[PDB]
Design an enzyme around this catalytic site. Structure first.
Site, short mmCIF file in Angstrom:
data_model
loop_
_atom_site.label_atom_id
_atom_site.label_comp_id
_atom_site.label_asym_id
_atom_site.label_seq_id
_atom_site.Cartn_x
_atom_site.Cartn_y
_atom_site.Cartn_z
N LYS A 1 0.79 -1.18 0.00
CA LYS A 1 0.00 0.00 0.00
C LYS A 1 0.83 1.23 0.00
O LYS A 1 0.53 2.15 -0.75
CB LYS A 1 -1.17 -0.02 0.98
CG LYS A 1 -2.40 -0.70 0.40
CD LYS A 1 -3.25 -1.47 1.40
CE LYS A 1 -3.01 -2.99 1.39
NZ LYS A 1 -4.24 -3.79 1.62
N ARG B 1 -19.47 22.91 20.26
CA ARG B 1 -18.54 23.23 21.33
C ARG B 1 -19.17 24.15 22.38
O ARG B 1 -20.09 24.91 22.10
CB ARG B 1 -17.31 23.88 20.77
CG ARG B 1 -16.52 22.96 19.86
CD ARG B 1 -15.81 21.83 20.60
NE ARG B 1 -15.13 22.21 21.85
CZ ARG B 1 -14.27 21.40 22.50
NH1 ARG B 1 -13.98 20.19 22.03
NH2 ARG B 1 -13.69 21.80 23.64
N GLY C 1 -16.29 20.61 25.26
CA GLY C 1 -17.32 19.80 24.65
C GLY C 1 -18.38 19.39 25.64
O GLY C 1 -19.56 19.63 25.44
N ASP D 1 -21.39 15.22 32.78
CA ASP D 1 -21.08 14.00 33.59
C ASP D 1 -20.56 14.32 34.94
O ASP D 1 -19.57 15.04 35.11
CB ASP D 1 -20.06 12.96 33.08
CG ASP D 1 -20.35 12.42 31.74
OD1 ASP D 1 -21.49 12.15 31.38
OD2 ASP D 1 -19.25 12.43 30.96
MN LIG Z 1 -16.25 13.94 29.56
#
Ligand SMILES: [Mn+2]
Ligand SMILES: Nc1ccn([C@H]2C[C@H](O)[C@@H](COP(=O)(O)OP(=O)(O)OP(=O)(O)O)O2)c(=O)n1
Ligand SMILES: [Mn+2]
Ligand code: NA
Ligand code: NA
Length: 327
Positions: free
Chosen positions: A64, A141, A181, A248
């Site tokens: 390749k 964002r 994020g 989170d």
């Molecule tokens: Mn995270």
DNA sequence: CATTAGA
DNA sequence: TCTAATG
């Protein structure tokens, strides 16, 4: 890093395409070590054979590489990038909750587009339903400007519940990052540590609160220690609502914070580098602790950490502000 | 690499 | 229980 540019980069495309479109773990495993090696190699690779010398460098790959040197292109890569069946997989997949596995199935059933996904919201589970739900919002964002606002509130509720709570928005934002994020909140409490058989409500109380005031709008998953949801800043005196954000929150055994905290604050590199160092400095560091090292080869004995400092002093380093945890 | 969903 | 998906 650049000299080996295209090569590794083509190598990854190929690799990624195996693990995702095909379920060819191995080949996928091939492309990567290879791509890892040439990536290390110090010179401009000149041909198949040359590359070929390297470990992982087989004939398949070498083959390749050549085609790649000769023509700045590859057929297989050309065909792939074309193949709608493969294009679709790479795409469905964006949906938070859609892994390759599912990405495949969906297609097979004939669910290629986002619209397909909606017409069949039924075939989709809650994660993926919310995923699809906020697909737009998910991909964007987070302005720091907003980060401060969000943070503001988390802290406040957390404190309103019990006073003993301790919070920290770790990650990039913590590191001064212009944008982020998702928001990561580490959490701990006194009552909770290593042994003291949990207290599931601990996580539970806060989640309830944040929903209470309407910050957290949904639940992706809620376990006894890790919550994973979505939030949104109070759409003020309108005309401008807020985008739905992934958030989170994770419970931590107080006799573990700073490590974890240190850790989750990164960066990916600062970590290893810090990690590598503690090693020479006679230690070990991981997601939750730091252990003095023993000459027998390995040792244990979890040293007492009260803040990001100790961990420093421990490996005897300079206190490095989040700002500079850059690498 | 460990935690949650699901089936 | 395993297997997937996120981190
Ligand atoms: Mn995270
Ligand atoms: C490792 C890096 C972080 O400490 C943690 C994962 O957090 P994220 O995946 O969200 O990564 P960042 O916080 O670095 O990125 P951002 O907030 O910009 O998404 O695990
Ligand atoms: Mn993050
Ligand atoms: Na070789
Ligand atoms: Na996804």
């Amino acid at each position: 890093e650049t000299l080996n540019g295209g090569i590794t980069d083509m190598l990854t495309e190929l690799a990624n395409f195996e693990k995702n479109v095909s379920q060819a773990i191995h080949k996928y495993n091939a492309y990567r070590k290879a791509a890892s090696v040439i990536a290390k190699y110090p010179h401009k690779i000149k041909s198949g054979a040359e590359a070929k010398k390297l470990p992982g460098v087989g004939t398949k790959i070498a083959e390749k590489i050549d085609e790649f040197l000769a023509t700045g292109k590859l057929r297989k890569l050309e065909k792939i990038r074309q193949d709608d069946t493969s294009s679709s997989i790479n795409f469905l997949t964006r949906v938070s909750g859609i892994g390759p596995s599912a990405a495949r199935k969906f297609v097979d059933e004939g669910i290629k587009t986002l619209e397909d996904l909606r017409k069949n919201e039924d075939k989709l589970n809650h994660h993926q339903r919310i995923g699809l739900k906020y697909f737009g919002d998910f991909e964007k964002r987070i302005p720091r400007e907003e980060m401060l606002q969000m943070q503001d509130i988390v802290l406040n509720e957390v404190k309103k519940v019990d006073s003993e709570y301790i919070a920290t928005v770790c990650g990039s934002f913590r590191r001064g990052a212009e944008s982020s994020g998702d928001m990561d909140v580490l959490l701990t409490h006194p009552s909770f540590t290593s042994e003291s058989t949990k207290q599931p409500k601990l996580l539970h109380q806060v989640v309830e609160q944040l929903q209470k005031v309407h910050f957290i709008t949904d639940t992706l998953s809620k376990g006894e220690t890790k919550f994973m949801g979505v939030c949104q800043l109070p759409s003020k005196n309108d005309e401008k609502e807020y985008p739905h954000r992934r958030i989170d929150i994770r419970l931590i055994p107080k006799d573990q914070y700073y490590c974890g905290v240190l850790y989750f604050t990164g960066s990916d590199i600062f970590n290893k580098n810090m990690r590598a160092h503690a090693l020479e400095k006679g230690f070990t560091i991981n997601e939750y602790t730091i252990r003095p090292l023993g000459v027998t080869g390995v040792a244990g004995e979890p040293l007492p950490v009260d803040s990001e400092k100790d961990i420093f002093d421990y490996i005897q380093w300079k206190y490095r502000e989040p700002k500079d945890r850059s690498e």
